[PDB]
Amino acid sequence: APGASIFRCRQCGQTISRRDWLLPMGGDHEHVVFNPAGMIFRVWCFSLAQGLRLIGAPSGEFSWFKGYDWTIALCGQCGSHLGWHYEGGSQPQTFFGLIKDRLAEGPAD
């Protein structure tokens, strides 16, 4: 009965990812970053995620991960901004960077 298994959207409970899918990018699954608006994010990298809606076309502007282009990832259920999907890079080609404090962690479904 693990209690730290699944990540859900904090606002609505949509299933988003899993602890098993944490991805250590450059040696750490956690990356502390800031955007041009000065917002600090504690980003957890995941190999896979679900329940999101990726919005727009990819952009390389201000990417926190060298070689990757990003798209905003919203909760597909409630529209909460949960992070970004990264693509266009290498090893892996793609991954998700999700904002840790916008997820709730809990037992499996």
Ligand X SMILES: O=C1CC[C@H](N2C(=O)c3ccccc3C2=O)C(=O)N1
Annotated binding residues for Ca(2+), written as ranges, equal 28, 30
* One of 2, 26, 27, 37 touching ligand X (CB under 6 A): 37
Q: Does 80 bind Zn ion (CB under 5 A)?
A: yes
* One of 9, 49, 52, 73 touching Zn ion (CB under 5 A): 9
The number of beta carbons lying within 10 Å of the beta carbon of residue 55 is 12
Nearest distance from C-beta of residue 106 to ligand X, angstroms = 26
In angstroms, the CA 69 to CA 61 distance is 8
| 3-class secondary-structure state, position 92 | coil
Q: Of 33, 2, 13, 39, nearest to 97 (Cα)?
A: 33
Q: Does 17 bind Zn ion (CB under 5 A)?
A: no
In angstroms, the CA 18 to CA 48 distance is 8
Pick the stretch among 20-28, 45-53, 62-70, 99-107 that binds ligand X (CB under 6 A).
Answer: 62-70
* One of 44, 46, 70, 96 touching ligand X (CB under 6 A): 70
What per-residue string of b and e applies to 30-43 under the rule 16 or more CB within 10 Å gives b?
A: eeeeeeeeeeebeb
Q: Does 95 bind ligand X (CB under 6 A)?
A: no
Residues that bind Zn ion (CB under 5 A): 9, 11-12, 14, 75, 77-78, 80
